[PDB]
Amino acid sequence: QFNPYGDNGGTILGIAGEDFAVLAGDTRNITDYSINSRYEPKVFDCGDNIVMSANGFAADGDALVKRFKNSVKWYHFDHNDKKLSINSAARNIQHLLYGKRFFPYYVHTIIAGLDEDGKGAVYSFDPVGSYEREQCRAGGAAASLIMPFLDNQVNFKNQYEPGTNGKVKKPLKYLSVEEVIKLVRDSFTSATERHIQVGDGLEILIVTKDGVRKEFYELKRD
Amino acid sequence: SDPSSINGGIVVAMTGKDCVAIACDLRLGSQSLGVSNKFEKIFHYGHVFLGITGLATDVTTLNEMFRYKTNLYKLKEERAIEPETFTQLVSSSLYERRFGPYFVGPVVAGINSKSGKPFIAGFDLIGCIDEAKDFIVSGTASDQLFGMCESLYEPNLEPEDLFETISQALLNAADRDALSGWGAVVYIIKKDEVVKRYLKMRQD
Amino acid sequence: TIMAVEFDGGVVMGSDSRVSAGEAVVNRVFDKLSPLHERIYCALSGSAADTQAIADIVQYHLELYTSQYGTPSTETAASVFKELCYENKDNLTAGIIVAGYDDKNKGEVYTIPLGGSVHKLPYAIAGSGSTFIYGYCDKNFRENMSKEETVDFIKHSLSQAIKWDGSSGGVIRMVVLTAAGVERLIFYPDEYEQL
Amino acid sequence: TIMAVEFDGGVVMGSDSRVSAGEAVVNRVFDKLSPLHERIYCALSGSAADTQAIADIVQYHLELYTSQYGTPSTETAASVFKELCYENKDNLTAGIIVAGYDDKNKGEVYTIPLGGSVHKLPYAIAGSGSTFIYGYCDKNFRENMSKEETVDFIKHSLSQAIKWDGSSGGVIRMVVLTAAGVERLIFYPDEYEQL
Amino acid sequence: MDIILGIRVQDSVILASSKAVTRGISVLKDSDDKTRQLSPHTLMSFAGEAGDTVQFAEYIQANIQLYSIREDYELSPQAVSSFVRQELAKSIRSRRPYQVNVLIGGYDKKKNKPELYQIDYLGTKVELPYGAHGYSGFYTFSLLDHHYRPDMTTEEGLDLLKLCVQELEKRMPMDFKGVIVKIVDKDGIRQVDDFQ
Amino acid sequence: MDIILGIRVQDSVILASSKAVTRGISVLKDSDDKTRQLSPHTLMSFAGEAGDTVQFAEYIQANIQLYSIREDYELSPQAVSSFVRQELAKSIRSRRPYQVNVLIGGYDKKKNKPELYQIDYLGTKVELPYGAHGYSGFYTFSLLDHHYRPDMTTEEGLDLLKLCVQELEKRMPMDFKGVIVKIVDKDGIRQVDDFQAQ
Amino acid sequence: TTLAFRFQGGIIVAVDSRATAGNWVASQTVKKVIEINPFLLGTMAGGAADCQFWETWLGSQCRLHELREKERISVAAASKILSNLVYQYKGAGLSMGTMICGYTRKEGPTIYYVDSDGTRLKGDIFCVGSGQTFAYGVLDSNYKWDLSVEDALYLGKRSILAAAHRDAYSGGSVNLYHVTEDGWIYHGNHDVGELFWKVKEEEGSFNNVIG
Amino acid sequence: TTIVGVKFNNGVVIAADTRSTQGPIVADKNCAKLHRISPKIWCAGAGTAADTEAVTQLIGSNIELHSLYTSREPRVVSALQMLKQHLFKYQGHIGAYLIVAGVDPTGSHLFSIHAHGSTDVGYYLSLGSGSLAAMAVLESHWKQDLTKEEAIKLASDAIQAGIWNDLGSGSNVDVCVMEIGKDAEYLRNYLTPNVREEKQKSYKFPRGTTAVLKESIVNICD
Amino acid sequence: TQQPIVTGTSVISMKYDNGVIIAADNLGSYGSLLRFNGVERLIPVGDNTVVGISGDISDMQHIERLLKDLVTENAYDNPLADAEEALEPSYIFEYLATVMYQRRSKMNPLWNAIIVAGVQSNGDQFLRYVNLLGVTYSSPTLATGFGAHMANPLLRKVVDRESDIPKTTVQVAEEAIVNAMRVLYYRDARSSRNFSLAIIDKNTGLTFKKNLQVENMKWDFAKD
Ligand SMILES: *C(=O)[C@H]1NC[C@@](C)(O)[C@](O)([C@H](CC2CCCCC2)NC(=O)[C@H](Cc2ccc(OC)cc2)NC(=O)[C@H](CCO)NC(=O)CN2CCOCC2)O[C@@H]1C
Ligand SMILES: *C(=O)[C@H]1NC[C@@](C)(O)[C@](O)([C@H](CC2CCCCC2)NC(=O)[C@H](Cc2ccc(OC)cc2)NC(=O)[C@H](CCO)NC(=O)CN2CCOCC2)O[C@@H]1C
Ligand SMILES: *C(=O)[C@H]1NC[C@@](C)(O)[C@](O)([C@H](CC2CCCCC2)NC(=O)[C@H](Cc2ccc(OC)cc2)NC(=O)[C@H](CCO)NC(=O)CN2CCOCC2)O[C@@H]1C
Ligand SMILES: [Mg+2]
Ligand SMILES: [Mg+2]
Ligand SMILES: [Mg+2]
Ligand SMILES: [Mg+2]
Ligand SMILES: [Mg+2]
């Protein structure tokens, strides 16, 4: 019988700074045990300073990112060049996803940008459009490997002040863009080591008030 | 259905400078229902430590079985079993039930009393030996532990440090697993002495 | 068991005469060669219902074509079959060979297997009995044979397919398409079995 | 694709050289003609595991036969294969041809299909690729051919079976069984494809 | 399922067991004792598949009684639970496993302490302050996580049961026809006849 | 299943209906009224699939209430039962049938006689002296077969139910949390508020 | 794990904050309460998308009722829109268990349980989700009508903590709401992480854990 | 897994990758798949890892016993006949797939065994998820009359095709060389082309970071 | 939902300094029977694009007709059909990618793997893959069916990453492609000796090579 879904592997990771946000993914695309591409980008600049990745079944990923980019173009036409706030993006994607509730997009999607107060923001979505804003989130094949590390090193979970008898929690003092990239690169060197569907390339898109910058790093190719 | 997913539970072992460490959660559940907050998964036979994860009736049975086999060993050999040897006994004991196996993921830790070399190993339920120098992970949050250990672990950690590293790897991986947590215990093993510490952790 | 072969004077079409329902022979003297125009024939293999429904629709399409645009090419006849078999592939179990003679391109043979694909060929074999005669047909087919050699090649080929395939039997019917018109040939067991 | 043919001199056994795991070729150059005795050989088709395990047991039984009662007949070798294949029919997927030569009876060919049945035949085809050469083999085999005629009849036969069957390919090996003894023959693609 | 509770207080173990026996559409009996005395200071309650339940209880009873006469000695509660777990642990990998869950409430005369053992049909043994088998657990565990103290008297422990049995009469879909209650303490096993 | 009882006496019809609503392992409510007033002298009790039960009841109600205003007149119990039977008999051959069983108890002011109709989810209708739906009937029919008389007073009718509910509290495995009891007579519909120990 | 109960002092609403994908813990920082209007709360349990999308859609339909009829929508009529919606999707595989909790002058304080089966029930006490039984356990054995706001808030919090502890598929934190004549008041987010130890000490309960 | 056998003019070499996986997860970044049945008869397996290891040790122990019993060097056709007859008995329920290479008094040999008890022979073989990638390198570069240095090069390059193009295979290359004259030589980590890059950050926690309820010394002695 | 009947095996492809190369054997299989030996699976569109198709052959002939129509349609009211507004590889690919994904979404797929190889009007090499699920990717080497498993490993030794494309000549890349086709004949049971090859070079244009054969096979080691 024909099966309308596949799994093209890969992994994504959003982290929110005070006045910036990063969305990063690997650039590897796989089927079963074969590599399709070592460099097939998966994170996208959709404009109005929003970046988006729809990781999972790459076909449902490409259809969704396509339909959102078109939502952004028609929002400009229909509302006199007004800028699509990240919160408004999120809700629009909810409707995009939920419209296919009984034949879903097999993707876990994240978006990053700035809210209307200039603070960094990360929204993440289940395949049928459940969504929530968050400080950080990893999605895809290695999500179960990285999310625990993010809890520990981004949100300081299970960590306390030395010699306070585990009564004073470590304060949430917040991360610089240099420090966030360090955690992202380690998060991917780790996933690449322990997940066979992760490697080849790491693409990071950084969103500040001055726009969208891209960084690229090699990863192991086994 | 899946015997390895009824009760839940996790074990992890790490090596350090002249020392090993082994930790487990304390949860014993029946699917969604947590039942006991006091079910230890780490046991010892002399100076060889075994953690077990999986179906809790097999965790109990295997412990009783290795105590039996290690007691007879000691009476005949006139010395305690060593980690390298115990690992081979666990391996062969599991492969013996090949077409009816114990639904467990065992983990051995200890220091060879002669050589003083730190040693850890892990097994699948039919007894394949996974011998790594760095760390060994098992249970319903094995995915999360793999990611926590890979990131956090550096070689040649002093016992005091290794204690923070294994504790942080367990706590954070357990908090991302429905079927693990409900308290944890951590053994810090050196040639001469062994310290056992209960960790404060989220009780949900 | 059905086949068409492209020779010097035109093209030749042959078939067994068996209609079966399981292992019961329903008719042992059926005619599986059906005319679509004056010089264009089809050979039917598969479901009796599915093949007969299709042949009737193609016939209609070529009678309407003729009324409007004069004589259709053999290629055209094949394209109508292909279109029906391709678009209804979920509900059809038909294998069809199409053989035609005009004065421009002389003899042509087209084959439309289960999927709905079209294959132009010097000769085509099809049906259950065909599996047994691939080796024979491939070692024995030549281009630019005579009418007498081509009838011989097809008589022998189908003879072996009837012998080996329990889903084939009876008489061998043939149709010869040349400038001169349409010639109907029959060969009975007593002639072809002793080859 | 495997066959044996009974000629004047004695008997010839042929096979392709293909071992496959679905559409993957595991080995393109495998020998499927194993000796049971000095001038008795078997040709194997079916499961690799099942045919090897049975070939080894037949061999063991004929080595013990020879120790106690001397030279076994071909009939006797066929009989042991039958016995295994029949009594273990529920667990075995193996189709076996046995060809041997002694000085009283000369050349003999036995075939043992999935049933566990035995059939003594002038020639024998078996394996996936045989379906395509039934017509060609029936039409081209006659009694009391020479070694060279028989090597040619097999060469052409397996050539066709390889060309049409995707489960068959590689080199044609043959083994010639005469009063002289055993002669091994191999034929590479560049020879047999251009037939 | 049938209702099988137990709770260990300061100086005793209390077992509460439902009195209903139902087959398809009819309650056949409304006064059923889902308990066997194993030895004068050890009591086992049980619930599960129809015949298995008593057949397993009586087989254990026989064996512990035999041991008593042979050694003219009462096995500790720890020893008896260990015996029972091993029988079930064998049972699960046999041709037709015993489908029976049990609580073992005992008073250890050596240590002068009550002990409550919860054991499922897989041979999953654990010692608890309070335990339950089947759907009961879902209501009674969080209830007793609130209202349980370790130094409670036998009287405070009966009150604590009344509170569990009312919650289950209110919120559980099965009419289980109330419970028979037994106390296991230093003087042995007695039945509270007046829980109605 | 839930408990749906009806019994027709001399001058009234008495419907008795379980107060329990149970999803899976939790009794959610213990005071459910499994009945809608269709007209001032016609009452319908219902049990079946979670959603369909009330959706069907309230739909019938609206239609009967509409008919009442349009004709300024109350349909006979016989007429209401025939309307309801036909609605179900359509539902049974539709894409997703209403899985709802009903009793209709009504007092016909033209005939001056009480009437009890039992109708299953297929559109099977019958007039009965006493009726039941689900497992309840396995006990009550043989009970009433013994203790029923057609000339009974409404007061006797209620003792005959108290006898049916005790038998069900004894022998059925479900806790159905007792019954709500309604009388339909020449004076309309009233709820017997003291059945908790009558 | 969600609950709502009615008492002398209005309504108490308490919910956990955990999202699961089987045995994977997806989040511990989730809102399970929709604030529909200053006097209407909706609770979410079941499919994450199904709850969020349709309780947001209820929010729109309620606003549309205010513009049209120049009147705040009744709890009865709000519960019945969601009820009637859900009923159209019956058999299709929607999954939601929800309490519509609100105050109108006409109705007084009112709670409606509505579930994806079509079931719509008025009541004083509901608990909804995988954790419901754990919550009922504590709630049903401490409930009176005559509790103080302070005590009723606590019982609601303490009943979610209870289920957070035992139910593997509940936890993170307790969100608390109080619904009066003057609308809903939010009584804060309480991380089970720190709440459990503060309660176990102060209350002397949870004796089963070593601490 | 990727394993290869290559015959050369005076013996035979085998090679394997060093990656062990639990589903999509890399369990051991460097595990030795190269085992000895006897001093000059080596083994490499794929399929159920407990089955390959277990079946290797059993035939290895029986071969030792047989060696002592006949006062003769173990032969390869013995290890072959024993594996074959054992795997066949268990109808493929023992998920062992092996390449066995070795030298003995009769010459040098290269065979392969599948779970059902089929055996293969050839001048070059391969097995595992990396089978097809390795076989493509072998089919392209193999020639008759290979030297030792050429056969190590060819077998090593076949394992790389696996490491790079197969998700089931990676890390380093193990090689065993068995020459007819000399002792078998085992080159653990012959190639290490997948070294992890130095992390961006040290994750050493300040001491006392973890909350401890209860402490106690454990008694190991009497 | 269908099942493929007459089917074609691996299409293999790679890009080199100045263009792209693509090849595919001339076989139409019918299960295990090697039925049709005259089948072209390289479809040239204009003079800057070749489309290689694997899988169901009837669905291939449908995509053949769709591409001829696309050439016709583009000529309509287009006095620049042979200049600035000629069809591109990127244009032809995005159409097929659209159509494949719609057909999977209607649960009636075209049972194919397609590689579109070409040179764009600005000289850039174009190589991209789409199949019955609508899944798409690019890589300096692409292959379908068996060729993903055997060809990609061999062609990746010549071009591992993007930086190697300016270092690879037509000679080196064509040689790698003909070698890969030989290996596939050795090890793919549904393969043929007879194959077609196409080169799209930004200078020499479109070279389309018919009736090629795998030569220089090693079988001689067999006899022992
Ligand atoms: C050579 O290769 C011959 N092989 C023999 C044969 C008989 O199978 C057949 O294909 C022949 C084709 C001609 C076509 C022109 C009409 C006469 C027959 N086929 C049949 O005779 C056909 C067998 C068949 C049935 C069904 C299917 O697939 C569904 C394939 C083949 N016979 C029938 O259909 C009989 C006709 C009774 O009047 N009906 C049934 O078997 C009833 N079945 C219908 C399908 O559902 C099951 C019941 O000739 C070729 C050339
Ligand atoms: C001519 O007709 C040839 N056609 C080719 C072929 C392959 O079918 C075969 O029968 C050939 C026979 C030789 C005999 C001498 C020993 C080598 C094999 N058979 C195979 O290659 C065989 C195919 C096969 C497998 C299974 C079954 O039924 C269960 C029938 C045929 N190959 C294998 O068995 C490979 C061996 C790998 O070393 N492995 C598998 O197929 C894997 N398992 C098979 C059981 O199912 C689970 C997977 O030659 C004839 C003459
Ligand atoms: C108390 O009883 C809580 N128990 C926790 C929990 C998680 O089970 C749940 O029911 C919760 C409801 C809340 C979650 C937070 C948003 C508001 C709603 N449900 C989930 O978290 C939900 C579980 C679930 C999945 C599937 C189904 O049947 C379809 C029922 C429940 N999680 C999800 O839906 C995840 C979200 C994060 O990944 N996503 C999916 O399951 C995606 N699949 C959904 C089904 O369709 C295919 C895609 O909270 C109660 C109150
Ligand atoms: Mg990797
Ligand atoms: Mg947890
Ligand atoms: Mg072939
Ligand atoms: Mg238990
Ligand atoms: Mg929990």
Side-chain angles (χ1 to χ4, degrees), chain B residues 41 43 45 50-70 86 89-97 101-107 123-126, chain E residues 85 89 93 123:
Chain B
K41 285 169 205 82
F43 324 83
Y45 321 95
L50 178 72
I52 323 170
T53 64
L55 195 58
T57 188
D58 292 344
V59 170
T60 299
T61 296
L62 274 188
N63 170 40
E64 289 166 357
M65 166 191 290
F66 291 139
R67 188 179 52 192
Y68 180 122
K69 286 183 184 198
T70 50
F86 182 64
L89 177 62
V90 167
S91 190
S92 51
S93 294
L94 296 163
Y95 194 83
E96 195 183 301
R97 278 287 148 271
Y102 295 120
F103 292 113
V104 309
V107 178
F123 324 71
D124 66 25
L125 73 161
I126 55 168
Chain E
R85 192 205 81 84
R93 289 174 200 282

Side-chain angles (χ1 to χ4, degrees), chain D residues 1-2 15-16 18-22 26 30-32 44-52 93 126-130 165 167-168, chain H residues 97 112 114 116 118-120:
Chain D
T1 321
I2 51 144
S15 80
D16 73 303
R18 175 161 291 172
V19 179
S20 53
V26 193
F30 193 78
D31 198 0
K32 312 173 172 193
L44 310 172
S45 88
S47 168
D50 286 4
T51 50
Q52 287 180 337
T93 311
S128 48
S130 57
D165 180 22
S167 315
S168 302
Chain H
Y97 297 78
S112 83
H114 296 235
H116 281 281
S118 48
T119 40
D120 216 6

Side-chain angles (χ1 to χ4, degrees), chain H residues 83-92 94 96 113-115 117:
Chain H
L83 286 169
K84 164 146 76 149
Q85 279 169 3
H86 178 102
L87 290 170
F88 191 77
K89 205 180 73 160
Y90 286 92
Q91 289 282 275
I94 293 188
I113 325 208
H114 296 235

Side-chain angles (χ1 to χ4, degrees), chain D residues 1-6 11-17 30-34 41-45 97-99 109 123-127 130 133 150-151 153-159 161-162 171-177 183 185-187:
Chain D
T1 321
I2 51 144
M3 64 186 300
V5 190
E6 189 183 315
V11 87
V12 195
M13 268 212 131
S15 80
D16 73 303
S17 69
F30 193 78
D31 198 0
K32 312 173 172 193
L33 303 170
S34 314
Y41 277 69
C42 64
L44 310 172
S45 88
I97 300 178
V98 176
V109 176
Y123 71 102
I125 61 173
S130 57
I133 56 165
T150 301
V151 167
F153 172 58
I154 290 168
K155 188 203 265 200
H156 290 76
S157 283
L158 298 184
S159 174
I162 286 160
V171 292
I172 296 172
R173 286 168 220 266
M174 302 166 74
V175 148
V176 194
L177 269 31
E183 185 183 352
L185 300 174
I186 191 161
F187 297 97

Side-chain angles (χ1 to χ4, degrees), chain A residues 28 192 195-196 198 222, chain H residues 19:
Chain A
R28 171 180 285 178
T192 294
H195 205 119
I196 68 164
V198 178
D222 39 358
Chain H
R19 170 177 300 182

Side-chain angles (χ1 to χ4, degrees), chain B residues 32 35-36 56-58 60-61 64 100-101, chain E residues 85 89 93 118 122-124 126 128 138 141:
Chain B
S32 48
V35 172
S36 179
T57 188
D58 292 344
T60 299
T61 296
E64 289 166 357
Chain E
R85 192 205 81 84
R93 289 174 200 282
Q118 188 181 133
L122 303 176
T124 312
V126 72
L128 293 173
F138 285 96
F141 276 128

Side-chain angles (χ1 to χ4, degrees), chain D residues 65-140:
Chain D
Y65 187 103
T66 293
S67 288
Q68 290 176 74
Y69 329 115
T71 285
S73 57
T74 307
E75 197 192 19
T76 299
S79 197
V80 173
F81 265 115
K82 180 264 278 202
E83 204 55 38
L84 290 173
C85 288
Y86 184 72
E87 295 295 355
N88 300 298
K89 60 166 60 196
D90 300 351
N91 270 247
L92 286 181
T93 311
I96 279 154
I97 300 178
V98 176
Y101 178 93
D102 64 56
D103 294 275
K104 192 167 265 165
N105 314 285
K106 306 306 181 166
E108 286 192 348
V109 176
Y110 294 80
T111 192
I112 300 146
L114 250 50
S117 49
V118 211
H119 306 273
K120 196 173 176 307
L121 297 168
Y123 71 102
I125 61 173
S128 48
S130 57
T131 108
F132 308 120
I133 56 165
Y134 271 85
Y136 176 101
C137 291
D138 186 74
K139 274 303 205 179
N140 285 111

